[PDB]
């Protein structure tokens, strides 16, 4: 992880995070279904409705929320050791 709030923040609600969805996460899954949560017997077709809200919500990139809620760049790299012929090995040097 590192700090990216100074350059990423201007706010920019392009990277909106899903809040309403069917259930919790399972390993190795992608959350791309932009489907409105169904919390009632009545189907949610027909845009917004009572007790059925779109998962999209603001996630505080406004400049007012400076110290908090500003974007921090975090990346996680999966590493596999002794499973396949290694392709990424570290530097040696010396000549």
């Amino acid at each position, epitope marked *: 992880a590192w700090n990216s709030n100074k350059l990423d923040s201007k706010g920019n609600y392009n990277y909106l995070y899903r*809040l309403f969805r069917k259930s919790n996460l399972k390993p190795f899954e992608r959350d791309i279904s932009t489907e409105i949560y169904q*919390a009632g017997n009545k189907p949610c077709n027909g845009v917004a409705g009572f*007790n059925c*809200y779109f998962p999209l*919500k603001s996630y505080s990139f406004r400049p007012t929320y400076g110290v908090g809620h500003q974007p921090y760049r975090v990346v996680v790299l999966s590493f596999e050791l002794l499973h396949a012929p290694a392709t990424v090995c570290g530097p040696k040097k010396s000549t």
Partner: nanobody
Amino acid sequence: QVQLVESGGGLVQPGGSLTLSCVASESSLAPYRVAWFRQAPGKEREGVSCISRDAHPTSTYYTASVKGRFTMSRDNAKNTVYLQMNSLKPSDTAVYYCATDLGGYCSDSNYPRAWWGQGTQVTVSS
């Protein structure tokens, strides 16, 4: 399908305290968020407090008028949530309702509103 019951309201003096309860029956409120609403006659229903399924302070939301005075706590075994009032004002005099949905987490402006109880009358006067 779940039904709720609000009770504990009554005639209290200004500066007093009250403790409401939203009893749920026939269903479990553990994986679902619960919100408290009040509606005095003459004005539209407004949010008061919102507790989530995890009952975490981050997921715990109160409205501006009740910050620092109103507190909730949900007991999952009995399937009930409270709305503890501290230092009640006459402006708080309203019919308090509790509502829940299939959602599990509240927001600053996202409160469950599906199944409402009969409500309880909280009166703050001499």
